Amino acid sequence: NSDLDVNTDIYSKVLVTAIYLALFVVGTVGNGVTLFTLARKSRVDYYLGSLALSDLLILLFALPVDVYNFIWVHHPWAFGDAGCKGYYFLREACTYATALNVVSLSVELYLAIRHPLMSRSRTKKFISAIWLASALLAIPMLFTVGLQNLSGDGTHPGGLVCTPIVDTATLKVVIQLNTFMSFLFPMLVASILNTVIARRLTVMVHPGRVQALRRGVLVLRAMVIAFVVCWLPYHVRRLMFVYISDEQWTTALFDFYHYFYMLSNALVYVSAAINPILYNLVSANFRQVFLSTLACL
């Protein structure tokens, strides 16, 4: 089954791998210590913790499977049907949860800057609601991807790959679903909200709350722009994967699709690693307790 092979150079594999491992350690340590101190510590801490969990899931259970079975060995898939579906399901649920957390944070900040409720119980209930909804919107992937023997006769175990098992139309529908619901719409809402939040901050600012508020505004805007920039090439690739006709696909577009895969996923991990570092760059006491928690290791 030499038709399933790709020609991505070794140096690119090693480079992208090294990047993935760097983002792995930075992201896991960052979000791990983040969850640690946040748990040891306030309304936004639940959203931040939710984000940290969302990132940790990808960094721990999606990153190794990716770096192994997607850039190093393209075939055969060695995680089974359950691993195949559970992987993409996890990814989708994660991106949905992240997006919804961002938008929710935008709303919370706007309300905390326009009028300066949501008790601890109610807030946690709402976070649970976000997670559940995220899991619900990730369901189609369980019915979209799967295992297929793409070898010449469909009998060779080396041709057992993890590929979408549904037709082009349905694939279009689910990919569009993900792109609209987890990217365009929510980040649009969050961008508008951030836009209003900025000027509201400028008009409010004309004692110690306004500085933390400014901090929150900058952090939030940073998270939004990071989300857009990082998740942009990701959604373009998935649309590129399906919308291009089978006759239009050439070897150049193939190899380029794989390099683009490397790039896009690299940025995807860059986001998950960029979440906690932004919390440190504000020079808040969070960085102090970050070094404090990082020291005892």
């Binding site: 793409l150 979408p164 089978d246 696909w249 070897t251 699709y257």
Partner: peptide, 7 residues
């Protein structure tokens, strides 16, 4: 000629 199988 050939189409990707990785999503």
């Amino acid at each position: 000629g050939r189409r990707p199988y990785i999503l």
